[PDB]
From Swiss-Prot:
Disulfide links within the chain: none
Entry binding sites for heme: H36, H60
Residues annotated with N6-acetyllysine modification: K2, K11
One term of GO molecular function: enzyme binding
Portion of the full sequence shown: 9 to 93 of 134
One GO location term (cellular component): membrane
Designated gene of the protein: Cyb5a
Protein's recorded name: Cytochrome b5
Superkingdom classification of source: Eukaryota
Keyword Heme tagged: yes
Chief location of this protein within or outside the cell: endoplasmic reticulum
Domain Cytochrome b5 heme-binding: from-to ranges: 1-77
GO BP terms in the entry: response to cadmium ion
Subcellular location(s) per record: Endoplasmic reticulum membrane; Microsome membrane
Family that this chain belongs to: Belongs to the cytochrome b5 family.
Amino acid sequence: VKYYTLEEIQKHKDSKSTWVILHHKVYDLTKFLEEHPGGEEVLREQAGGDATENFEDVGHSTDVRELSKTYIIGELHPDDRSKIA
Ligand code: HEM
């Protein structure tokens, strides 16, 4: 996986490209964005910060982890990941 800092993810704050750093692991649900029963403006609404907060809020099933696999992108820089602290 490529270590991209928010400097990049930030550029992925749109429909075409919308990720959500969760558990230090950013996911590219820009594809399954429409396949998500959540929304289209709520998934991207957090396409810049941490969605894990909102993602964990709704309380996603434990079988959701296996859900997104191919969509996954990797994990933003580990140095920047500790910066979001
Ligand atoms: C990329 C990973 C994600 C996957 C694989 C995923 C998967 C799912 C699935 C299968 C549902 C149905 C069951 C459930 O989990 O409640 C759902 C619902 C939902 N998801 Fe996600 N989700 C993801 C990320 C997010 C994020 C980042 C948000 C927003 C912060 C979000 C918000 C919601 C909401 C609001 C619901 C609908 C629950 C209800 O009826 O109120 N999800 N998600």
